[PDB]
Design an enzyme around this catalytic site. Sequence first.
Site, PDB file in Angstrom:
ATOM      1  N   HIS A 114       0.603  -1.238  -0.131  1.00  0.00           N
ATOM      2  CA  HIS A 114      -0.155  -0.162  -0.032  1.00  0.00           C
ATOM      3  C   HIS A 114       1.063   1.070   0.320  1.00  0.00           C
ATOM      4  O   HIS A 114       2.133   0.668   0.041  1.00  0.00           O
ATOM      5  CB  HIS A 114      -0.768   0.078   1.545  1.00  0.00           C
ATOM      6  CG  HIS A 114      -0.209   0.275   2.526  1.00  0.00           C
ATOM      7  ND1 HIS A 114       0.011  -1.490   2.863  1.00  0.00           N
ATOM      8  CD2 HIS A 114       0.626   0.660   3.257  1.00  0.00           C
ATOM      9  CE1 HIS A 114       1.019  -0.711   3.942  1.00  0.00           C
ATOM     10  NE2 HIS A 114       1.222   0.635   4.301  1.00  0.00           N
TER      11      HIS A 114
ATOM     12  N   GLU B  81      -8.019   7.910  10.231  1.00  0.00           N
ATOM     13  CA  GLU B  81      -7.540   7.081   9.408  1.00  0.00           C
ATOM     14  C   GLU B  81      -8.384   6.272   8.141  1.00  0.00           C
ATOM     15  O   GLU B  81      -9.182   5.960   8.300  1.00  0.00           O
ATOM     16  CB  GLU B  81      -6.026   6.499   9.487  1.00  0.00           C
ATOM     17  CG  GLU B  81      -6.485   4.805   8.827  1.00  0.00           C
ATOM     18  CD  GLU B  81      -5.268   4.277   9.618  1.00  0.00           C
ATOM     19  OE1 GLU B  81      -4.493   4.564  10.664  1.00  0.00           O
ATOM     20  OE2 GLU B  81      -4.560   3.278   9.315  1.00  0.00           O
TER      21      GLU B  81
ATOM     22  N   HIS C 279       6.621  11.979  -7.020  1.00  0.00           N
ATOM     23  CA  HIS C 279       5.548  10.991  -7.008  1.00  0.00           C
ATOM     24  C   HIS C 279       4.923  10.168  -7.422  1.00  0.00           C
ATOM     25  O   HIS C 279       6.072   9.092  -8.242  1.00  0.00           O
ATOM     26  CB  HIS C 279       4.769  12.381  -8.432  1.00  0.00           C
ATOM     27  CG  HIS C 279       5.966  12.229 -10.077  1.00  0.00           C
ATOM     28  ND1 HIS C 279       6.567  12.434 -10.094  1.00  0.00           N
ATOM     29  CD2 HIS C 279       5.171  11.870 -10.764  1.00  0.00           C
ATOM     30  CE1 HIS C 279       7.052  12.151 -11.236  1.00  0.00           C
ATOM     31  NE2 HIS C 279       5.649  11.640 -11.727  1.00  0.00           N
TER      32      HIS C 279
ATOM     33  N   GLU D 150       0.074  12.556 -11.495  1.00  0.00           N
ATOM     34  CA  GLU D 150       0.420  12.305 -12.973  1.00  0.00           C
ATOM     35  C   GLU D 150      -0.381  10.908 -13.074  1.00  0.00           C
ATOM     36  O   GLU D 150      -0.455  10.164 -12.292  1.00  0.00           O
ATOM     37  CB  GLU D 150       1.581  11.215 -12.881  1.00  0.00           C
ATOM     38  CG  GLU D 150       2.479  11.238 -14.069  1.00  0.00           C
ATOM     39  CD  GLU D 150       3.206  10.659 -14.781  1.00  0.00           C
ATOM     40  OE1 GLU D 150       4.567  10.570 -13.865  1.00  0.00           O
ATOM     41  OE2 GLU D 150       3.389  10.484 -16.404  1.00  0.00           O
TER      42      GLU D 150
END
Lengths: 121, 121
Positions: A7, A37, A62, A111
Amino acid sequence: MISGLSHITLIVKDLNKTTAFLQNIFNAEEIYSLSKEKFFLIAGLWICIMEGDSLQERTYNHIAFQIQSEEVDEYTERIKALGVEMKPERPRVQGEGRSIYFYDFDNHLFELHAGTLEERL
Amino acid sequence: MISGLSHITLIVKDLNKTTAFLQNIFNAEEIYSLSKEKFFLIAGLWICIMEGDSLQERTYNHIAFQIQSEEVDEYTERIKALGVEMKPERPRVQGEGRSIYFYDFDNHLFELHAGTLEERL
């Protein structure tokens, strides 16, 4: 052997706010919500969001997600229409495909790329 | 629909140095090496490394890879044996599995977790 990715965990100032963003753009399905969370699946991908002022400065570090060519314009539209921060689009190498960059509220760069590593070589 | 993940791009000060690290621990296969950068597959995962002093401060923002229970101790060993920064291991919820956290040379936090989101609920 390492299986796959487990994750990605991201730290954001406002939880609820990041959430709407995620499930809006990335269409994340929440899994659930001690410490505040939330978990999500984005393109079958275990994303965890934890509340916290941990948002040190903007970098080129990123995550890029794979979208498809026709989607690029539609996705551009969506990002603009959430008023989220979105860089203007640069043409790459007409054979390297297109990409779009935009931030979440917490210095996270995202992105959306279109065009497999496979062909990207 | 977003396909999957495209790639994660990471910015590191020394290229060569990060590389050895990656292919050592994560056993990354390089794809190839204008601007200095290198591509890797880690657990069938497109990771890109770009040279740059872009290493703003340590946060809990991190990538976790899925390993398996028996591997945890062996992987602990490896990380220690590269003299990379590795936090001491916390027991979680005996039914939430184990995790190990360690840094690369450039403020990047990595987690090796063992135990699927599936059971993690």
